[PDB]
Amino acid sequence: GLSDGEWQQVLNVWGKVEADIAGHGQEVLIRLFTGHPETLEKFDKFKHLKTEAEMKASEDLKKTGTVVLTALGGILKKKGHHEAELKPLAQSHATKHKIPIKYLEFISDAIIHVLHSKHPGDFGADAQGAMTKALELFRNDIAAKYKELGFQG
Template sequence: MADFDKVLKCWAVVEADPDAIGGEVLNCLFMEYPDTQKQFPKFAAIPPAELAGNAAVRKHGGVVVRKLGELLKAKGDHTLILKPLATTHANIHKISLNNFKMFKEALVKVFAAKGLLDADGQAALRNVMDVIIADIDGFYKELGFQG
C-alpha cells in the first residue's frame, strides 16, 4: 500500500497532461526496445525520428497512463480493471508479459528524467508495476495465453 501512495504523490502532474507524459513513455519504450513498436500496428511504420511528435502516439500514451492511474488508485484491488485489459492484451493484441516489463522500465526512466520520482519513488513504481505484471501473468495463465 505504501508503494502505491509513493507513486500517487506525483500523479497529479501526470493527470495534468497525460497525453504528453504517456507519449514520452511510449517514445522511450520504442527507442529503448525498438521491437515493441511492431506491437502497435498503427505506429509500426512511423520512423523513429518522427515518434516523439506524433499525435497518435501521444494520444495512445494518454490512454495508457490514464488506465495506469486507475490501477494505481485501486491500490492492488484492481481485478475489475485489470482482467479485461489482460484479456484484450492476450486474445486480441497478443502482448507478451515481457513487453509489460519493458514498459515498466520506460515508465520509470521517464518519471525519473522528469523529476517526478526520486530513487525511493522509482523503486516503489517498480514494485507496484511488478504487482500489476504478476496479476496480468495470472490472468494470462487463466486464459491459456503463453505470453
C-alpha cells in the same frame, strides 16, 4: 502487496504524471519503441514511423499515450483492488493484441526511466521503490491471467 505508506508515494508520484498525461505518455511510448523496436510491430497504426522525430511529431501517439496512462492511473488508484479493471485489460492484451508479458516489463522500465528524466532529482529513492513494486504488482496480476489463458508466448 504494498503498505499504505507506499500507496501514498505511488499516488504522490502519479500526481506529477497527471499534470501532463499527454507529454508523459508520449515519452513513455517513444522510450519503449526506440529501445525495443520489435514492440513497434504490435501497433498497425505506428508501423509507419521509422524515426524518433516522426514519433515525436505524431499526434496520434500522444493520443495513444493518454489512453494507456489514463487506464494505468485508474488501476493505481484502486491500491491493488483492481480485479475488475485489470481482467478486461489482461484478456485483450493476450487474445486480441498478443502482447507477451515481457513487453509489460519493458514499459514498466520505460515509466521509471521517463520519471527520472522529466523530474531529475525529485523522484526520490523511496518513490522509485513504491512505484516499482506497484508496477510489479500490476504485471504479476496480469501474468496470472495470462497463465489461465495459456498465453504461453
